[PDB]
Protein backbone atom coordinates (compact mmCIF):
# COMPACT_ATOMS: atom_id res chain seq x y z
CA UNK A 1 0.00 0.00 0.00
CA UNK A 2 1.69 3.13 1.31
CA UNK A 3 5.53 2.86 0.94
CA UNK A 4 7.91 6.03 0.92
CA UNK A 5 9.63 3.93 -1.81
CA UNK A 6 7.73 3.62 -5.04
CA UNK A 7 9.87 0.69 -5.84
CA UNK A 8 8.85 -1.01 -2.83
CA UNK A 9 5.17 -0.41 -3.65
CA UNK A 10 5.30 -1.72 -7.04
CA UNK A 11 5.42 -5.11 -5.44
CA UNK A 12 3.00 -4.83 -2.73
CA UNK A 13 0.14 -3.29 -4.89
CA UNK A 14 0.66 -6.91 -7.11
CA UNK A 15 0.32 -8.95 -3.40
CA UNK A 16 -2.68 -7.10 -2.04
CA UNK A 17 -5.30 -9.45 -1.65
CA UNK A 18 -5.56 -12.71 -2.24
CA UNK A 19 -3.45 -14.53 -5.44
CA UNK A 20 -4.25 -17.34 -7.43
CA UNK A 21 -1.36 -19.72 -7.87
CA UNK A 22 -1.11 -22.50 -10.40
CA UNK A 23 2.05 -24.85 -10.30
CA UNK A 24 3.27 -27.22 -12.93
CA UNK A 25 6.02 -29.60 -12.41
CA UNK A 26 7.42 -32.39 -14.98
CA UNK A 27 9.71 -34.98 -13.75
CA UNK A 28 12.18 -37.69 -14.04
CA UNK A 29 13.52 -39.38 -10.81
CA UNK A 30 15.65 -42.80 -11.90
CA UNK A 31 13.74 -43.77 -15.32
CA UNK A 32 10.09 -42.15 -13.78
CA UNK A 33 8.62 -39.61 -15.47
CA UNK A 34 5.56 -38.10 -13.50
CA UNK A 35 3.82 -34.82 -13.45
CA UNK A 36 2.22 -32.57 -10.65
CA UNK A 37 -0.08 -30.13 -11.08
CA UNK A 38 -1.25 -28.03 -7.97
CA UNK A 39 -3.41 -25.05 -7.29
CA UNK A 40 -4.34 -22.55 -4.65
CA UNK A 41 -4.23 -19.11 -2.99
CA UNK A 42 -1.26 -16.90 -1.34
CA UNK A 43 -1.57 -14.31 0.53
CA UNK A 44 1.44 -12.37 1.35
CA UNK A 45 -0.02 -10.21 3.94
CA UNK A 46 0.20 -13.11 6.06
CA UNK A 47 2.78 -14.96 4.68
CA UNK A 48 0.26 -17.73 4.17
CA UNK A 49 0.00 -20.50 1.24
CA UNK A 50 -2.91 -23.09 0.09
CA UNK A 51 -2.05 -25.19 -2.25
CA UNK A 52 -3.21 -28.43 -3.29
CA UNK A 53 -0.99 -30.77 -5.79
CA UNK A 54 -1.79 -33.54 -7.82
CA UNK A 55 0.17 -36.14 -9.56
CA UNK A 56 -1.33 -36.59 -12.94
CA UNK A 57 0.43 -39.44 -14.35
CA UNK A 58 -0.81 -41.76 -11.63
CA UNK A 59 1.20 -42.52 -8.51
CA UNK A 60 3.83 -40.01 -7.39
CA UNK A 61 7.01 -42.08 -7.56
CA UNK A 62 9.00 -40.34 -4.56
CA UNK A 63 7.64 -39.22 -1.84
CA UNK A 64 5.64 -35.71 -1.30
CA UNK A 65 8.00 -34.61 1.25
CA UNK A 66 11.07 -34.68 -0.98
CA UNK A 67 9.02 -31.97 -3.44
CA UNK A 68 7.61 -29.55 -0.73
CA UNK A 69 10.50 -26.96 -1.18
CA UNK A 70 10.41 -27.53 -5.51
CA UNK A 71 6.75 -27.00 -5.81
CA UNK A 72 6.75 -19.58 -4.20
CA UNK A 73 9.26 -17.29 -2.15
CA UNK A 74 7.29 -14.07 -3.37
CA UNK A 75 4.43 -15.19 -0.95
CA UNK A 76 6.75 -14.37 1.89
CA UNK A 77 5.72 -11.65 4.82
CA UNK A 78 8.11 -9.34 4.51
CA UNK A 79 7.49 -7.04 7.88
CA UNK A 80 7.17 -3.05 6.85
CA UNK A 81 10.72 -2.37 7.85
CA UNK A 82 12.23 -5.50 5.93
CA UNK A 83 10.11 -4.56 2.52
CA UNK A 84 13.20 -3.21 1.03
CA UNK A 85 14.79 -6.83 1.09
CA UNK A 86 12.38 -8.34 -0.70
CA UNK A 87 13.82 -9.76 -3.98
CA UNK A 88 10.91 -12.21 -4.99
CA UNK A 89 8.36 -9.43 -5.15
CA UNK A 90 10.55 -6.85 -6.76
CA UNK A 91 10.83 -9.22 -9.49
CA UNK A 92 7.46 -9.15 -10.36
CA UNK A 93 5.10 -9.36 -12.71
CA UNK A 94 8.33 -10.61 -14.77
CA UNK A 95 9.16 -13.16 -12.34
CA UNK A 96 12.39 -15.22 -11.49
CA UNK A 97 14.25 -18.12 -11.74
CA UNK A 98 14.56 -20.32 -8.85
CA UNK A 99 17.21 -23.50 -9.57
CA UNK A 100 18.53 -25.91 -6.90
CA UNK A 101 20.11 -29.19 -6.57
CA UNK A 102 19.18 -30.91 -3.50
CA UNK A 103 21.21 -33.64 -2.20
CA UNK A 104 19.95 -36.62 -0.17
CA UNK A 105 22.35 -37.89 2.13
CA UNK A 106 23.86 -41.29 0.91
CA UNK A 107 21.35 -41.06 -1.97
CA UNK A 108 20.75 -39.07 -5.11
CA UNK A 109 20.06 -35.33 -5.72
CA UNK A 110 17.15 -33.50 -7.95
CA UNK A 111 17.64 -31.03 -9.98
CA UNK A 112 15.37 -28.18 -10.22
CA UNK A 113 15.02 -25.11 -12.35
CA UNK A 114 12.03 -22.77 -11.63
CA UNK A 115 9.98 -20.23 -13.19
CA UNK A 116 8.11 -17.73 -11.18
CA UNK A 117 5.58 -15.28 -13.16
CA UNK A 118 2.61 -13.43 -13.47
CA UNK A 119 0.16 -14.92 -16.23
CA UNK A 120 -2.49 -12.56 -16.13
CA UNK A 121 -3.66 -11.93 -12.47
CA UNK A 122 -1.93 -15.66 -11.70
CA UNK A 123 0.98 -16.64 -10.39
CA UNK A 124 2.90 -19.35 -12.52
CA UNK A 125 5.14 -21.87 -11.05
CA UNK A 126 6.36 -23.74 -13.93
CA UNK A 127 9.49 -26.66 -12.84
CA UNK A 128 11.41 -28.84 -14.35
CA UNK A 129 12.68 -31.67 -12.11
CA UNK A 130 15.36 -34.23 -12.59
CA UNK A 131 16.61 -36.82 -10.14
CA UNK A 132 19.68 -39.27 -10.87
CA UNK A 133 21.87 -41.93 -8.74
CA UNK A 134 18.81 -42.61 -6.31
CA UNK A 135 19.21 -46.51 -4.75
CA UNK A 136 16.51 -48.47 -5.59
CA UNK A 137 16.20 -50.03 -1.66
CA UNK A 138 16.79 -46.43 -0.41
CA UNK A 139 14.37 -44.07 1.54
CA UNK A 140 13.30 -41.75 -1.12
CA UNK A 141 12.43 -44.62 -4.23
CA UNK A 142 11.68 -46.88 -1.05
CA UNK A 143 8.93 -44.68 0.32
CA UNK A 144 10.17 -44.69 4.16
CA UNK A 145 9.68 -41.11 4.85
CA UNK A 146 6.97 -40.03 6.92
CA UNK A 147 4.04 -37.58 5.79
CA UNK A 148 4.84 -34.65 7.37
CA UNK A 149 7.33 -32.14 7.44
CA UNK A 150 9.55 -30.32 10.24
CA UNK A 151 9.89 -25.89 10.34
CA UNK A 152 12.89 -24.13 9.68
CA UNK A 153 14.42 -21.43 8.98
CA UNK A 154 16.43 -20.66 5.64
CA UNK A 155 19.41 -18.28 5.33
CA UNK A 156 19.08 -15.48 2.34
CA UNK A 157 21.96 -14.23 0.89
CA UNK A 158 22.32 -11.47 -2.06
CA UNK A 159 24.45 -12.58 -5.08
CA UNK A 160 25.12 -8.69 -6.66
CA UNK A 161 27.38 -10.90 -9.41
CA UNK A 162 23.95 -12.02 -10.74
CA UNK A 163 21.72 -9.48 -9.47
CA UNK A 164 19.97 -12.15 -7.47
CA UNK A 165 20.35 -14.38 -4.15
CA UNK A 166 21.77 -17.56 -3.00
CA UNK A 167 20.55 -19.97 -0.58
CA UNK A 168 22.13 -23.26 1.17
CA UNK A 169 20.00 -24.69 3.64
CA UNK A 170 19.78 -28.23 4.84
CA UNK A 171 15.94 -30.08 5.11
CA UNK A 172 15.51 -32.85 7.39
CA UNK A 173 13.00 -35.53 6.48
CA UNK A 174 11.97 -38.22 9.37
CA UNK A 175 12.14 -41.57 8.39
CA UNK A 176 9.61 -44.40 9.66
CA UNK A 177 12.15 -45.78 11.78
CA UNK A 178 12.66 -42.45 13.61
CA UNK A 179 15.95 -41.66 11.60
CA UNK A 180 16.53 -39.04 9.56
CA UNK A 181 17.26 -38.37 5.56
CA UNK A 182 19.34 -35.43 5.76
CA UNK A 183 18.36 -33.11 2.09
CA UNK A 184 20.81 -30.79 1.80
CA UNK A 185 19.47 -27.67 -0.43
CA UNK A 186 21.30 -25.60 -2.50
CA UNK A 187 19.72 -22.31 -4.50
CA UNK A 188 19.81 -19.38 -6.51
CA UNK A 189 17.05 -16.88 -8.05
CA UNK A 190 17.86 -14.26 -10.75
CA UNK A 191 15.46 -12.56 -12.14
CA UNK A 192 14.08 -12.81 -15.69
CA UNK A 193 13.65 -9.03 -16.26
CA UNK A 194 16.63 -6.77 -17.47
CA UNK A 195 15.58 -3.78 -14.68
CA UNK A 196 16.21 -3.17 -11.19
CA UNK A 197 15.66 -5.50 -8.21
CA UNK A 198 15.81 -5.23 -4.52
CA UNK A 199 18.60 -6.90 -3.55
CA UNK A 200 18.44 -7.88 -0.20
CA UNK A 201 20.79 -8.33 3.12
CA UNK A 202 21.26 -10.92 4.24
CA UNK A 203 18.22 -12.53 6.17
CA UNK A 204 16.07 -15.52 6.89
CA UNK A 205 13.16 -16.80 6.13
CA UNK A 206 11.11 -18.86 8.92
CA UNK A 207 9.11 -21.88 7.16
CA UNK A 208 6.18 -23.50 8.56
CA UNK A 209 4.52 -26.04 6.77
CA UNK A 210 1.73 -28.88 7.28
CA UNK A 211 0.87 -31.52 4.98
CA UNK A 212 -2.66 -33.00 5.30
CA UNK A 213 -4.66 -34.80 2.86
CA UNK A 214 -8.23 -34.51 0.97
CA UNK A 215 -10.41 -37.30 2.35
CA UNK A 216 -12.58 -36.91 -1.03
CA UNK A 217 -9.86 -37.31 -3.18
CA UNK A 218 -8.91 -40.40 -5.27
CA UNK A 219 -5.88 -39.30 -6.65
CA UNK A 220 -2.17 -39.48 -5.82
CA UNK A 221 -2.26 -35.72 -3.54
CA UNK A 222 -0.49 -33.18 -1.18
CA UNK A 223 -2.51 -30.97 0.52
CA UNK A 224 -0.08 -27.74 1.57
CA UNK A 225 -0.26 -24.83 4.19
CA UNK A 226 2.63 -23.43 4.56
CA UNK A 227 3.57 -19.81 6.57
CA UNK A 228 6.65 -17.89 5.70
CA UNK A 229 7.65 -14.76 7.61
CA UNK A 230 10.61 -13.18 6.62
CA UNK A 231 12.98 -12.24 9.71
CA UNK A 232 16.70 -11.36 10.89
CA UNK A 233 16.49 -7.72 10.55
CA UNK A 234 15.53 -5.82 13.82
CA UNK A 235 13.75 -2.35 13.88
CA UNK A 236 16.20 -0.65 16.24
Known amino acids: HHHTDPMVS ?20 NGHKFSVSGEGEGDATYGKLTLKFICTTGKLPVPWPTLVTTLVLCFSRYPDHMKQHDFFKSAMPEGYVQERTIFFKDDGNYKTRAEVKFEGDTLVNRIELKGIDFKEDG ?43 LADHYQQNTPIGDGPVLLPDNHYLSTQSKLSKDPNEKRDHMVLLEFVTAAGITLG
Open 10 to 29: KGEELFTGVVPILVELDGDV
Open 139 to 181: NILGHKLEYNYNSHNVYIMADKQKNGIKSNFKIRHNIEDGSVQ
